[PDB]
């Protein structure tokens, strides 16, 4: 399962 | 044995022809399980492995929802990293995201991974402790400011720590007839002439699964490592895998050199020397 | 920027038999940037129905890809694996060695 996370930007 | 989950995600620009080209792949161990690609026609996370197919829609509905999200993430970063290296807005550039965890053959966490890539060098890495980063540049400086800041460690180490590790024990229950095997390999040795006074033995490994595995020679109990000749272990494309190894020996003393096997099948290593 | 090598790697899934169906393989690995063009040769010619892997990476960030055919070996025919790559300034040209 793939990380439910909102990544935030670099 | 030891196992791990890995999400592999690649984007691509291609500026004025649209937006990027985004493919993920995630892997137990170094077998596929799943795929996206933002130029396939599903636009839906899809299955790679039969083990995985068993998963109802609502599995595929939120891995579908988290990876086109994953991909929108790495459209913007393009656009950013462009700027923090005074780079042309028209050349084509690389984001690489790869991210998972491992258990022990204990079946306890044993490592979490959270690592970037620009261009195809190290940008920010997760270090092992989960709290701290690496940023390889001073752009990378600016990056690891801002995931401080946002407290992103945190978030990623409950997923690492947690819900990675959960679903890794339920995969590899659920394939465990291909994922928890092991195929030792089939070994073989090949001899052939290069001038009157040496020939090429070159020791194959084939059908071995997992792909970890150590091919080394010896003349007389002593390494050979310099004059070796070694192939990278490569896919048979049915599952397994296959390595070659090989050496430049005086005809005559083809018996002074052993060929040297190891791998998880074979309770214990493999010493072999040329047949005639 | 830095730019790597396709290394190449043309083999068969099962050890090779006259008469015999098998698969060709064409392993590249080790590439970057990704954008790669293989082609799988029997006596020069392209093979239309080929496919490939979906574009992974390894620990160093670059690029692998498995290209592969159903095939059956024979004395006469040559096989060879075509790559093109921006490291590449002519495209590299790899033969089967029809055993090893």
Same mark, same amino acid.
């Given at each position: 399962?793939?990380?439910?996370?909102?990544?935030?930007?670099? | 044995?030891?196992?791990?989950?890995?999400?592999?995600?690649?984007?691509?620009?291609?500026?004025?022809?649209?937006?990027?080209?985004?493919?993920?792949?995630?892997?137990?161990?170094?077998?596929?399980?799943?795929?996206?690609?933002?130029?396939?026609?599903?636009?839906?996370?899809?299955?790679?492995?039969?083990?995985?197919?068993?998963?109802?829609?609502?599995?595929?509905?939120?891995?579908?929802?988290?990876?086109?999200?994953?991909?929108?993430?790495?459209?913007?970063?393009?656009?950013?990293?462009?700027?923090?290296?005074?780079?042309?807005?028209?050349?084509?550039?690389?984001?690489?995201?790869?991210?998972?965890?491992?258990?022990?053959?204990?079946?306890?966490?044993?490592?979490?991974?959270?690592?970037?890539?620009?261009?195809?060098?190290?940008?920010?890495?997760?270090?092992?402790?989960?709290?701290?980063?690496?940023?390889?540049?001073?752009?990378?400086?600016?990056?690891?400011?801002?995931?401080?800041?946002?407290?992103?460690?945190?978030?990623?180490?409950?997923?690492?720590?947690?819900?990675?590790?959960?679903?890794?024990?339920?995969?590899?229950?659920?394939?465990?007839?291909?994922?928890?095997?092991?195929?030792?390999?089939?070994?073989?040795?090949?001899?052939?002439?290069?001038?009157?006074?040496?020939?090429?033995?070159?020791?194959?490994?084939?059908?071995?699964?997992?792909?970890?595995?150590?091919?080394?020679?010896?003349?007389?109990?002593?390494?050979?490592?310099?004059?070796?000749?070694?192939?990278?272990?490569?896919?048979?494309?049915?599952?397994?895998?296959?390595?070659?190894?090989?050496?430049?020996?005086?005809?005559?003393?083809?018996?002074?050199?052993?060929?040297?096997?190891?791998?998880?099948?074979?309770?214990?290593?493999?010493?072999?020397?040329?047949?005639? | 920027?830095?730019?790597?090598?396709?290394?190449?790697?043309?083999?068969?899934?099962?050890?090779?038999?006259?008469?015999?169906?098998?698969?060709?393989?064409?392993?590249?690995?080790?590439?970057?940037?990704?954008?790669? /063009?293989?082609?799988?040769?029997?006596?020069? !010619?392209?093979?239309?129905? %080929?496919? +490939?892997?979906? @574009? =992974?990476?390894? &620990?160093?960030?670059?690029?692998?890809?498995?290209?592969?055919? /159903?095939?059956?070996?024979?004395?006469?025919? !040559?096989?060879?694996?075509? %790559?093109? +790559?921006?490291? @590449? =300034?002519?495209? &590299?040209?790899?033969?089967?060695?029809?055993?090893?």
């Amino acid at each position: 399962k793939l990380n439910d996370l909102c990544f935030t930007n670099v | 044995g030891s196992h791990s989950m890995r999400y592999f995600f690649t984007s691509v620009s291609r500026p004025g022809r649209g937006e990027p080209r985004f493919i993920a792949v995630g892997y137990v161990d170094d077998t596929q399980f799943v795929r996206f690609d933002s130029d396939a026609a599903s636009q839906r996370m899809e299955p790679r492995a039969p083990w995985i197919e068993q998963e109802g829609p609502e599995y595929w509905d939120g891995e579908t929802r988290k990876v086109k999200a994953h991909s929108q993430t790495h459209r913007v970063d393009l656009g950013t990293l462009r700027g923090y290296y005074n780079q042309s807005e028209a050349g084509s550039h690389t984001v690489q995201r790869m991210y998972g965890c491992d258990v022990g053959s204990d079946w306890r966490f044993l490592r979490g991974y959270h690592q970037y890539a620009y261009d195809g060098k190290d940008y920010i890495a997760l270090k092992e402790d989960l709290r701290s980063w690496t940023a390889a540049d001073m752009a990378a400086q600016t990056t690891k400011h801002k995931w401080e800041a946002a407290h992103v460690a945190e978030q990623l180490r409950a997923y690492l720590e947690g819900t990675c590790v959960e679903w890794l024990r339920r995969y590899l229950e659920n394939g465990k007839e291909t994922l928890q095997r092991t195929d030792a390999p089939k070994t073989h040795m090949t001899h052939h002439a290069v001038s009157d006074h040496e020939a090429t033995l070159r020791c194959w490994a084939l059908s071995f699964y997992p792909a970890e595995i150590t091919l080394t020679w010896q003349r007389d109990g002593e390494d050979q490592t310099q004059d070796t000749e070694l192939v990278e272990t490569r896919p048979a494309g049915d599952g397994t895998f296959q390595k070659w190894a090989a050496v430049v020996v005086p005809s005559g003393q083809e018996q002074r050199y052993t060929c040297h096997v190891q791998h998880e099948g074979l309770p214990k290593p493999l010493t072999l020397r040329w047949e005639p | 920027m830095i730019q790597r090598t396709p290394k190449i790697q043309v083999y068969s899934r099962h050890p090779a038999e006259n008469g015999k169906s098998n698969f060709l393989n064409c392993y590249v690995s080790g590439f970057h940037p990704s954008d790669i /063009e293989v082609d799988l040769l029997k006596n020069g !010619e392209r093979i239309e129905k %080929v496919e +490939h892997s979906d @574009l =992974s990476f390894s &620990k160093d960030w670059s690029f692998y890809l498995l290209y592969y055919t /159903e095939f059956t070996p024979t004395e006469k025919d !040559e096989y060879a694996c075509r %790559v093109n +790559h921006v490291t @590449l =300034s002519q495209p &590299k040209i790899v033969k089967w060695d029809r055993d090893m």
